């Protein structure tokens, strides 16, 4: 649902999902042959399945190809400074 749908929220207001109380197989998404960018900071995907966390949040928004770069910690840019900024201690995964 958070990966394939008719329309998602735009970068001006990205939506949060609060995915929890369920199991996940991150390697299924890892092995997919359509996702290009997988800048997933913090816990490695190979141990992401085994590692248990309090919650796994979700995001979805539309940004330019050259402005995908602006969703990383310690970053400046048009989207990064104005629409969406990431904490310097970020932990999670990013897919584009």
């Amino acid at each position: 649902e958070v990966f394939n749908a008719t329309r998602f929220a735009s970068v001006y207001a990205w939506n949060r999902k609060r995915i929890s109380n369920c199991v996940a197989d991150y390697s299924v998404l890892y092995n997919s042959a359509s996702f290009s960018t997988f800048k997933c900071y913090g816990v490695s995907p190979t141990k992401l399945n085994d590692l248990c966390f309090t919650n796994v949040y979700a995001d979805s928004f539309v940004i330019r190809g050259d402005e995908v770069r602006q969703i990383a910690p310690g970053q400046t840019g048009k989207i990064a400074d104005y629409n969406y900024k990431l904490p310097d201690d970020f932990t999670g995964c990013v897919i584009a």
Partner: antibody, heavy 120, light 106 residues
């Protein structure tokens, strides 16, 4: 403080294999992938491949396919290479590069010492 | 894959001079270039972890710019410790490539 020590001073006659170690300390061996870079003065640095800890996920750079091998042991936080049939064109220095995160793409923020490969 | 071929074979600038380090990219990868400081006899040390950002422990002299295809790093002043090698890498895809390096001298 982050410690990434290297044994260094690796010399083997051509046609044989040598063992390289990369002991990591000062951070998490679980949450940090291991990436390798070889320093050649002729044309600068180059990427070897990527290995995940406590598993056998293999991704080898198209430049050093075949000879390059990836081996990681959870105990002692040591990652290994045993490159068989080293030639006289392989005389250079090996560095194991720690990345900022364990998710590609990365930029290998912290590099340790270098293990020199030399043919005698 | 994307291959790094820097355009500055050597850089000859004095102390405090304003000059840029230009490295090209094989194709338009947007902005995914990184920089390292490799002193002679020293492992390459991260200087600007991204195209135009600033990592921890960075001298204020280093500041890069990303035009999309021709990435440059402009340095207002050059000190003794800056005498090292400059490397560019593409963190866009899995197969990584490194630049040839540039030696700085007075």
């Amino acid at each position: 403080q982050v410690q990434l020590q290297q044994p260094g001073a690796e010399l083997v006659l051509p046609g044989a294999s040598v063992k390289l170690s990369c002991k990591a300390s000062g951070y998490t061996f679980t949450n940090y992938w291991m990436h390798w870079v070889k320093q050649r003065p002729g044309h600068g640095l180059e990427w070897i491949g990527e290995i995940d800890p406590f598993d056998t996920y293999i991704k080898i750079n198209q430049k050093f396919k075949g000879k390059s091998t990836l081996t990681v042991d959870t105990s002692s936080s040591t990652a290994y290479m045993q490159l068989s049939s080293l030639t006289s064109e392989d005389s250079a220095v090996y560095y194991c590069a720690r990345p900022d995160s364990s998710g590609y793409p990365v930029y290998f923020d912290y590099w340790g010492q270098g293990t020199t490969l030399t043919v005698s | 894959d994307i291959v790094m071929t820097q355009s500055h074979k050597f850089m000859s600038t004095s102390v405090g001079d304003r000059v840029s380090i230009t490295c090209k990219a094989s194709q338009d990868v947007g902005t995914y270039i990184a920089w390292y400081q490799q002193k002679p006899g020293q492992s390459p040390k991260l200087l600007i972890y991204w195209a135009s950002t600033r990592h921890t422990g960075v001298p204020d002299r280093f500041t890069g710019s990303g035009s999309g295809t021709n990435y440059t790093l402009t340095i207002s002043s050059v000190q003794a410790e800056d005498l090292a090698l400059y490397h560019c890498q593409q963190h866009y895809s899995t197969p990584y490539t490194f630049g040839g390096g540039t030696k700085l001298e007075i």
